[PDB]
Amino acid sequence: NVIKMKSSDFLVSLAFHRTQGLMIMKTVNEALLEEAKMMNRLRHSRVVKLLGVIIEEGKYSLVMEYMEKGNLMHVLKAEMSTPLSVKGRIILEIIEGMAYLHGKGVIHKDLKPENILVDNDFHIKIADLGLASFKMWSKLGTLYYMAPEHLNDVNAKPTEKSDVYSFAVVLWAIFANKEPYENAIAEQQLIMAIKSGNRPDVDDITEYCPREIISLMKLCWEANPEARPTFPGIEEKFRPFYLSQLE
Ligand SMILES: CN1C(=O)N[C@H](Cc2c[nH]c3c(Cl)cccc23)C1=O
Numbered sequence: 001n002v003i004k005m006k007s008s009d010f011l012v013s014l015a016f017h018r019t020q021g022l023m024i025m026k027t028v029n030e031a032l033l034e035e036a037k038m039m040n041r042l043r044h045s046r047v048v049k050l051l052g053v054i055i056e057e058g059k060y061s062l063v064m065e066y067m068e069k070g071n072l073m074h075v076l077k078a079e080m081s082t083p084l085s086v087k088g089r090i091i092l093e094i095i096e097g098m099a100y101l102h103g104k105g106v107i108h109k110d111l112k113p114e115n116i117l118v119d120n121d122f123h124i125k126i127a128d129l130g131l132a133s134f135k136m137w138s139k140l141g142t143l144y145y146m147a148p149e150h151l152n153d154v155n156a157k158p159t160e161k162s163d164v165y166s167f168a169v170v171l172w173a174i175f176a177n178k179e180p181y182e183n184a185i186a187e188q189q190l191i192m193a194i195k196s197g198n199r200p201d202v203d204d205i206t207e208y209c210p211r212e213i214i215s216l217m218k219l220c221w222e223a224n225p226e227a228r229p230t231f232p233g234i235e236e237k238f239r240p241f242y243l244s245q246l247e
């Protein structure tokens, strides 16, 4: 259903529930409430869960589960190493989360390392901290991970393939431990370049990355959306690969 909370329950912004504990909060009616109920259905181990909603007078808030190590780029850039089997696992979990989301008919629209949260055991959950998947709540950025068909075309409707492109770039970032396109002159020219086929510099992946993940990332950022696999297709390939060579 969906849990209406009050602000007296507490002591993006961290928030401290008096009975439930640590939560995160994005501070922003039948319609907002209804949207929130729809989002409340997204329940999966790899998906940041909507725990509650605060609808009061001078403030509207969405309340989500806390993830202890922050976003994925933060963890990737940490002074402490992140092993290959663990990166493979993170990829597998991202794939599971995305498949579940598309399975509920939800297209993310803004998947990127910031929207990939990480717990203390380096397990991940997909988030939507910018509310890209929302309609009513978003009303009240970097394009490194945005499919070319959306670049310079804000009216085209985003599909599951859009999220697959973002996923491709995320694979790249996972192996390079940084943002792509550091050599770019300016955003305009960069946008035209990516629209015409430019992609993250694979040579800028210095540490070891299996050739088939390089293959996967190249498949997933194909210019033609229909040449990209779905997330279940990706899983179909990647899971037995992960187990058999990585786990
Ligand atoms: C914005 N907030 C989240 O980060 N997780 C919950 C649930 C949620 C709504 N849309 C989501 C997408 Cl697109 C991905 C993961 C969770 C969600 C939420 O409402």
Ligand code: NA
Pocket (backbone or CB within 6 Å): 184, 185, 186, 187, 190
């Ligand atoms: Na730029």
